[PDB]
Amino acid sequence: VDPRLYFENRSKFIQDQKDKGINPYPHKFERTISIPEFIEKYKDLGNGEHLEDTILNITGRIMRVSASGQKLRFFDLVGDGEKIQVLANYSFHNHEKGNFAECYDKIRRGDIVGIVGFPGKSKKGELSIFPKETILLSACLHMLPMKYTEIRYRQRYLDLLINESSRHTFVTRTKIINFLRNFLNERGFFEVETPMMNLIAGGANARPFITHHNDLDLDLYLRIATELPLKMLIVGGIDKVYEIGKVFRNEGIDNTHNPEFTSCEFYWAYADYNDLIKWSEDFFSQLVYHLFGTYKISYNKDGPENQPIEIDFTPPYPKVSIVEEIEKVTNTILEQPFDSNETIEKMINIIKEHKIELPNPPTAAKLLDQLASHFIENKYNDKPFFIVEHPQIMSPLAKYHRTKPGLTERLEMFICGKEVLNAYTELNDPFKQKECFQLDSAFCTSLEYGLPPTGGLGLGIDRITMFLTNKNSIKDVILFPTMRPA
């Protein structure tokens, strides 16, 4: 009951075993089968049917202890997120390697044990290892919480050990990244690594982290996006390139925002806005079908206490032009240029009339993003959708819209009001790029060397995982989300 008492007395137990000549952290256990392999091998067994001739070395963590008397011990053995029973029987025990009561009265919950024993099914039909000998491989000194907070995030091993849904969540995350990596690779894409720190932070609009490099003696910027070096690789003839990796934005932490998060950015030469749209639809529909066998998934947008909303990932997804729909909903045209004093003040007026929060700073791109957020981002929640054709001031690195002046060929896919995908036709015309004289002289010079018509796309893998694992917080899909020390 007292945690310090349980920990201190189990440490005392460790030293008691050591003083007793038994190493509680033995050097090695020659495991022969994993718990999933055990379950797959011996699932087709009748109740009460042993396989006594088959001597297996299996390992796992003890998660339950019970007794039908001092002579019969029941345990729960977990390994790789799968469970079998442990049916210690005084008869099947090797009494020449230890006392049965001694060898099993010491086992507590959380204990990593190695078991020499045979497979079978109990009279209750439970798949079990019947141990002839059981070796504690690693003592869990602390008391393992039953199902109990910030702890899940800090000591993530506890969260993975007690909550099966947590391991399911992270297995889904890796399955998502595997599916995306495989998807791109099947489409001829080439996975690369670009620097995590650069002399600038370009690709998006966010505060960068600053870190000091000693041997170069300079303050480098943790990359906010992989956009620029990837487009440089497109210049370098890798026409189908991508990168899955962490990007850092030194901004606010909330349930959908982490300072560091897993982006996937691909750049696909000779691909236009429709190629990016079709890619987004194909990718999300195929990934959701892969992960669920259906295109419709449930998601607790308003938390687990409220009824979930069904998100239909059936393509095509609707595309909505931001400025057209802002002018429609707000019944005011945003005159170009969108950062003219008139247009800036007009957007501020629309925001003020609607009691929508004015963003810091009230730049026309930020005001446009706030207008989109309020008026169009939270109005398709049954399916994902694209907000498209953003003003060029919102996306300096996007190619100009062919037929709509001042707009771009940008697509940004939202799921339940959250931006999971940002894509557009890359601006390949160096003269048409402002800030070519943050911005890179290296990137602008690469543009001057010829960037082919490219389509770029970026995926917030953490957010996508949030939606496909039914998690409301991004801290629930990152194994060790950055937390405040206590």
Add this chain to the structure above:
Amino acid sequence: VDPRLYFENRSKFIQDQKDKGINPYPHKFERTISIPEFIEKYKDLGNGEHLEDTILNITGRIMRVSKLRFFDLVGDGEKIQVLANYSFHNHEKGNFAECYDKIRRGDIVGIVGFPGKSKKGELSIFPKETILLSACLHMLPMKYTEIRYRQRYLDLLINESSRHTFVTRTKIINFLRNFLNERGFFEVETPMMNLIANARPFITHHNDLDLDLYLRIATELPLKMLIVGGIDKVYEIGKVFRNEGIDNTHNPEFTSCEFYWAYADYNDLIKWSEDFFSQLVYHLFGTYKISYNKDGPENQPIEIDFTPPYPKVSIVEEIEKVTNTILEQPFDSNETIEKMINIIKEHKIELPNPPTAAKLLDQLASHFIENKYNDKPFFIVEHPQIMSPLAKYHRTKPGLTERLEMFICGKEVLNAYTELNDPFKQKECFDSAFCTSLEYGLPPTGGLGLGIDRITMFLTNKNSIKDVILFPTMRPA
């Protein structure tokens, strides 16, 4: 002849073209076939075999120029010829004369035409129409030398051996991911920013939390904690940051792969290392023996035979066999410390500052053992516990660990050991998070780490680590 004049007059030509209604950066070209697909569907065709009926839209970059024009098109690192003949050219989309002398070198162009072979046997496409997609306003060189590392796009467009280098890099990382995944390993992401960092950390500041975070020097601790959490085969491929000095084999930000494998022993990790290196080398080259220019391209390559098993060399016992001195235990005793400094002094090797026991052991191994097998990869094994405080103790050799350290051409590429999962067996507990994970119970586990850039160096025949990183962190002028 002038780079700047060529740039400026190409830009003036750009503004001209834009002012004459012509778009030198068109929005979308419906390319139907790719250059590799082209050199596949028409690789084996009769010399002189044209196909007038089959129309194809193809893109590429012009790399060479020459009523009969000849170009070179490269796409995805593969070349074809272009035969501009106005016999098949569509003048309604522009006169052939004006539309072909206009194209300069390095232009990304789209081409509507038909495949064929010429009377000389060269495989080409005859364009009925050719569109400039993106002009190269600077002159691309041919020979080129920091241009390689800074403007890597030129290095990938020109050399095509760097393209093969980085395709081999991605093939190596792909193969490593597939190799681990097939072995039941689960890929995860652990934080790149930590609250704690043997090397200097990268310090950054998070503003919202108003606190300094250190870029991870390794994926070690969180991966071990994941092992505690029941992810018994866990791994991470990603950047780790050691804020120290660059050289040809150390870059402060480098790609590490670290796996932790619950219930793995020393033999397990050794077998994994041999399997992975032999099978990766075979997956790449179809053989276990590779040719690597150890001392540069000016010298003859050495053959490295990745045929398993690889030699295992105990660091202490090989130091004692090479230098003919016996080192008492503990290895940090005053007598053994002063003895250890003495072999370095006797060989005029440099003394590490500070002269810590593990540092002197590192220096002795580096001079004496690490250059004992260059014809094959090999293992320096069983490092003393003062060299590997997170490593399990050797069971039959006192004071040693089950550590294994794989080397190719005297450069280390693999560090591995069984974890000291007994919390009370290391004074590092009496990281708080890591020690608490141990207290919750870490099984016997084998951990391993791979220097991806170094493995790529050795499999791409590159002497420097900047050659296997696409954008090495360079020094501005």
